[PDB]
């Protein structure tokens, strides 16, 4: 309990390149602790380190320290004796199969438990440079020792290298080598990829149906018509800087809009609601299956309430700040710095809210960081969907909020097409660059570390010369995948190829994550986690919000409801001039005229052009009406249809989700049978 | 395992009229088994053989029994049942009961007469089920269902109204009858722990739930009375109601006839008296109360969860779940494909009975249509017709309910549930679905379908001539139907629950079935049955559905339910203590499927209330007229004002009816009649078609539904998130118990 002596067996030997055992070779290496002490502060750190090392030795562990061949840095190898392993396996209730005994991953986990109970505080307080486990060997080369398997080499050769992209994930193998946390993360990623493949095939079918019915959408032909679409002069969008422009320049946008906006897309939106429900339920089943297989289950005011609401206000205070930043912007290098900016501020809030428990801190930081990223990523999409062009008024008296003038109307192509373009960008290009940066940054850091020259190097030095995966390693990966899932599900009513883009991205993502974790990053201590954690409630909330968001997208930001309404009610004799239902004349009977009579509350139109009547895209009465520029029966019918569609789709989808969740058992039948059999035989 | 010795110390004695102990009095009585064997076709011999076998097996299991001959019926024989202390302890080890210990709570055996009589009866019943008699034959339930044993039951302390003769015997039944279960104790606190100890955890949790329901109904009723008084005080400033009452304005409103024949154009004056009380019924006070009830439902559910967790800690409702024994009917007949086919057929039959009650509702509609004319020929006639229709629908539903109870028993018997709990759940879902449809179909039809599809006076909707509603809205009719159904069901159900057991006991006494012992006294009583408090839970859940689903009609429904529950606790406790035979205590950590049912009803209630306010209420039309149709672009008034509402909303109709008959000309001599819809007035370029006002009102209704649903669901989510389902004090007590043990 005091600094009686130092670490025994203090000898230096680095001749064996891959000696995961001690100098004697009898016992392997469970951990390595890196420090530097040969050169007030120095002597105090020496005293504290010697005291802690004496405590560790007195507790029963076997440690010995060797200085680096390449001086002032010393590594201590750590191995737990058989008796210590047995007693702490009895303490920590590990499920060994009773019919080299302990797998190296769980050996390292137990040793880390010992270090925590008697480590991170010293590491944080400049005492120990590092503390880590060791890999089998170099990933691309076999282990020199034959007794010790090169499980890492096999994992890299058949699962981590890109040449093994198509091969199935050795999930049991990666669980064994890395730990239950990484295992369940990759299992969830693979199951997500499978369900993405299913939904992407269905969405491709719907997209191709719309593609086949390309020249059968009459409004696009009317758009591309040099007469019907050429004699339509849409009013200028901005004051004195935008010109009166004809709809002819929107024919390509019209074709893409026929592809992206059709009853096929509506069917895919409904199917995507159903598929989200199925995804959640079958992930529950698969997670229960993994709980059975991997034995994931293990065990080990008023003043505060004012403080609770104190930070929540600050959290809400910062959220609206980053809202305006994106809106004013409407940028990758700023985004990455934004995250550590988010990290720093979320740390501060957690600091004032810390119950000092690691899991509680994780939950709080998860919620805060997810809110920050959610806003920073989906603010532009939400604006384009719901707030862009909806509050504009009309050419007479356009809505001026303040000295800031002329809240923008929609683009010539359409708000839905712009949203689809933004989704495609953030989905493909920025995700690809995220993967490229994610795979290059650790490799570049390792390259510069080697270039600093900091010949055969032993295993501890080899692993030390690597980037240490810091706190909350898999958290960023989960955040990335959850953002991708939010893009897939929240906005799937825009274009149906989002699951296909996510499918390609995930096929690359599994390989890039595995490759970087295997090669570029120092190995972490294996842990256990029966579920993905707070990400499960986050996904459930995203799923619930997805129904509302998709229904609102279809009703408000998509013109499908106005087109359906025109077909079913404004082609009949009382409103239309056709004997039966049709869609011709849709543009001429939906676009609203406007004579040039502007309030003097400037008149940019006279300076912009020499015309008299321009046709803007809203549903008001035409000029000359007894209540001109006012809303009309057609506008109120369209708004009624939008609201009714929202209500009907919301209620039907929610009831279907309830029925599916009720009629699909949470736990698989085979899982029940195997659990019952093992309980019977055990 | 064979019949060798039976009926130990067989002696006849009844001189001690109030004694729950044996003839010697050393050991008490945990149970009584009733049979009769002395008096065909060899079946009596077979039953004697089997019963002797079972008795010998029971005695070999170590129980102690004492059989007496009935003092009245020679054939009737009672057998008193007690378990020795060693057997009690070993079976407590078998099923790990939690007992006090030095007052901490611990497992099968503690360090601390000790066995409460309820626990003794529960343990003895467990033994009786486990022990075999004999192919393999299971236990007591098979014999009882087979008619071998006539009965098997526990015993009360004494007569409810009289103290026990034995001074050493505590009269907990007498105490529960004095300070509870009696009208003079209607307004006093419930000895919940005492009634739990006497009757069981299931009975205790039911009564706790009922008391807590009354507690929350008190708050809901207070807020409802506040809003109702707001509406009643604002009665004099109801501009639309006053404008209707005005003979100068309302007297010029000649509404078109409702029925095709023999109904005159009627003025709106006769609707003034209904409108005065209608203004209280659909006003911003009722809207605020509807929102408050949307919040209060979530508060009720969350606080009941907290109270239930507290009771789980205190009463140790979590007991080890031994494997449930099969039902005798299921085991009598023992592929799975045929059983699934039978289940599908049973579901088809249930849907058939649901269709039958739907047809009954349609018949009620036809009766309303056929009786409105005669009411008009002979207190407005439509109000009288609505009241009579409510009365007749209530009577018909009550009559059909008992028949459905019987047929649901038969259906669940025909289908095969493997265990008693599965039988309970299947019967729960089936019975609740039928009760839901039967009790809420009329209210749903009146709220959402009555008058919503009528068309205009030209070309009305025929099926024929679906019901049309009143200009003030059908909220008054919904309120009348709701109050009538609710109060009538309460009164009729309490009258049944009191008289039926009491009447059965009285006729049993009249058939001569004077000093009598405890076992005979309790035998001459009505058995509870294997179901138990299922029906009371069902009744209270139906009342909760009435309170929450239709709370947007009138705010005093919680007050009516409050009075009803105050009476309900007393009637149920009184009947259970006096009228009915004591029921074997059980364990139940929750109310069961009724809590998922309540959660589903709560989720449905937001939609139902929002749709009620938007469609069946006129509040949204009044608000829209005020805020958008007094203004110059639509109206004439310079500022926002409600006046002109009636003259501006009701749509005119010139007499041009299609010949697809024209009864209006035969039934009257008038030219322009005003009906309650927003279609275009005649002479409009698109006349008798929907108008911009109509679509504006529809848009307002839909937007209000969307906003209310989303906001209220968000509030409920935030409240459920902010309110922990486990009490802080309960968690602290759990931590203290864990630390001590
Ligand atoms: Ca990525
Ligand atoms: Ca990644
Ligand atoms: Ca399920
Ligand atoms: Ca009642
Ligand atoms: Ca009752
Ligand atoms: Ca809650």
Numbering used by the authors:
A (entry chain B): 43 to 81, 89 to 119, 121 to 149, 202 to 220, 233 to 414, 446 to 475, 517 to 640, 645 to 791, ...
B (entry chain A): 43 to 81, 87 to 149, 187 to 196, 202 to 223, 228 to 427, 445 to 488, 503 to 587, 591 to 640, ...
Provide the authors' own sentences about this structure as they appear in the paper.
TMEM16F, a member of the conserved TMEM16 family, plays a central role in the initiation of blood coagulation and the fusion of trophoblasts. The protein mediates passive ion and lipid transport in response to an increase in intracellular Ca2+. The protein is inactive under resting conditions and becomes activated in response to an increase of the intracellular Ca2+ concentration. Fungal TMEM16 structures have defined the general architecture of the family, where subunits, consisting of an N-terminal cytoplasmic domain followed by a membrane-inserted part composed of ten transmembrane helices (α1-10), assemble as homodimers.
To investigate whether equivalent conformational changes, as found for the mutant F518H, would also be observed in activating mutants that are located remote from the α4-α6 interface, we have determined the structure of the mutant N562A. This residue is located on α5 and does not line the predicted pore. A dataset of the mutant in detergent, in presence of 2 mM Ca2+ and 0.01 mM of the lipid PIP2 (N562ACa), allowed a reconstruction of high quality, showing two populations of the protein obtained after a 3D variability analysis and refinement of the two end states. A second population encompassing 38% of the classified particles, refined to 3.49 Å, is asymmetric with one subunit residing in the same non-conducting conformation observed in the symmetric class and the other subunit showing an arrangement that closely resembles the structure of the mutant observed in the dataset F518HCa (o), displaying similar movements of α-helices 3, 4 and 6. As in F518HCa, α3 and α4 have rearranged towards the opening of the subunit cavity although the extracellular parts of both α-helices are mobile and thus not defined in the density. Consequently, there is no direct evidence for a kinked conformation of α3 in this dataset. The structure of the N562A mutant thus confirms that the rearrangement of the subunit cavity in F518HCa and F518HCaND is not a consequence of the disturbed interface of α-helices 4 and 6, but instead defines a structural transition towards the active state that is adopted upon Ca2+-binding. Whereas this density is regular in the Ca2+-free conformation of F518H and around subunits in both populations of N562A where the subunit cavity has remained closed, there is a pronounced attenuation at the site of conformational changes in subunits showing an activated state in both detergent and lipid nanodiscs. These anomalies in the density distribution point towards a destabilization of the lipid and detergent environment.
